[PDB]
């Protein structure tokens, strides 16, 4: 049922595998089960829900918050890819060391993670701003994925080496992200904007923290999850980190724009680093 050799014969008391000389690659490890059909159905359900969310968001989404459009476009594009080839090469990489590495997921990360951190870097959406710290957020994060991908393709020790490399990059990514949220909390007005900024932080760290968690629980780690079981949990934290988080960031930037129009753009320097807090009256 795949584009590689799946039918074979055992010979010489199980010490020889004979396969057809059809030109297809063959490995016994690739034929291990991805999981239970109860988990496959659970994954195929959330695939539509996330796809429906992405479509509802692209509908709903139609300053210019281009960041939300990009991850949503990439998301529902990926689900079109996923519906038709959720386990075909190269959506799933069946490598020479028997590793099934879900490159579809890690590619979607590389496409959307820096765009979320860009949205985080300009949480208020105000003007051509950002900072030098933004580059630290984007350079470190791409690192974690590249190491995390490399770890998933690798096996044994070097998987740990590259996972620990990606973990160290991930620690740098989380801290600089806290420095962004901390300032963003004290920059946005005292109203509901600070409620949604704090909530965006929780959605951020929780969902983002689960990615190295699911890497340890999944086949990439000690395999306490199935390949289907890893697709389920990943979809949940994908939904949290991408579609719901971009929604609040949209709801935040709306509350900012209204406040900026009604009360104007008013700044009151507050000490922490000096932040220009948005206020109501001059």
Ligand X SMILES: CCCCCCCC/C=C\CCCCCCCC(=O)O
Window contacting its own copies (CB under 8 A); options: 114-122, 173-181, 211-219, 259-267:
114-122
Would you list the DSSP string of 205-245? HHHHHHHHHHHHHSTTTT--S-HHHHHHHHHHHHIIIIIIH
Window contacting its own copies (CB under 8 A); options: 100-108, 186-194, 220-228, 265-273:
100-108
Q: Provide the token pair at 27.
A: 């490995």
Give residue for tokens 């930037």: 253
* Contact flags string 205-224 toward ligand RET, x per CB under 6 A: ---x--xx--x---------
Selected from 39, 134, 238, 246, the binder of ligand RET by CB under 6 A is: 238
Nearer to its own copies, 96 or 269 (CB): 96
- Is residue 196 within 8 Å of residue 252, measured between CB atoms? yes
Nearer to its own copies, 154 or 231 (CB): 154
Minimum Å distance from CB 63 to its own copies? 10
Residue 154 binds which entry of ligand X, its own copies, ligand RET, none, CB below 5-8 Å type-dependent: its own copies
* Contact flags string 60-79 toward ligand X, x per CB under 6 A: ------x-------------
Nearer to ligand X, 109 or 228 (CB): 109
Would you list the DSSP string of 95-108? -TTS-EE-HHHHHH
135 binds ligand X per the rule CB under 6 A: yes
At 189 the three-state DSSP class reads: coil
Q: State residue 10 phi and psi, 5-degree precision.
A: -90, 135
**Interface with ligand RET in residues 157-186 (CB under 6 A):** 163, 166-167, 170
Give residue for tokens 């020479």: 96
Angle formed by the axes of helices 192-217 and 227-238, to 10°? Answer: 170
């Amino acid at each position: 049922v795949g584009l590689f050799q799946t039918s074979y014969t055992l010979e010489n008391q199980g010490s020889v595998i004979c396969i057809p000389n059809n030109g297809q690659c063959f490995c016994l490890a690739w034929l291990k089960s991805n999981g239970t059909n109860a988990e496959k159905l659970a994954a195929n359900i959330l695939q539509w829900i996330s796809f429906a969310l992405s479509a509802l968001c692209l509908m709903f989404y139609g300053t210019c918050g281009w960041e939300n459009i990009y991850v949503a476009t990439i998301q529902m594009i990926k689900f079109i890819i996923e519906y038709f080839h959720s386990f075909d090469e190269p959506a799933v990489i069946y490598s020479s060391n028997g590793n099934k590495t879900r490159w579809l997921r890690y590619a979607s990360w590389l496409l959307t993670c820096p765009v979320i951190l860009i949205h985080l870097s300009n949480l208020t959406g105000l003007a051509n701003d950002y900072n030098k710290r933004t580059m630290g957020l984007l350079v470190s994060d791409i690192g974690t994925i590249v190491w995390g991908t490399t770890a998933a393709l690798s096996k044994g020790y070097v998987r740990v080496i590259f996972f620990l490399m990606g973990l160290c990059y991930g620690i740098y990514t989380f801290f600089n992200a806290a420095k962004v949220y901390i300032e963003a909390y004290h920059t946005v007005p005292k109203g509901r904007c600070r409620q949604v900024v704090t909530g965006m932080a929780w959605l951020f760290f929780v969902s983002w923290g689960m990615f190295p968690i699911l890497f340890i629980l999944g086949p990439e780690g000690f395999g306490v999850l199935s390949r289907y079981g890893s697709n389920v949990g990943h979809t949940i934290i994908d939904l949290m980190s991408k579609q719901c988080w971009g929604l609040l960031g949209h709801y935040l930037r709306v509350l900012i724009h209204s406040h900026i129009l009604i009360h104007g753009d008013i700044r009151k320097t507050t000490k922490l680093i000096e932040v220009e807090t948005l206020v109501e009256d001059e």
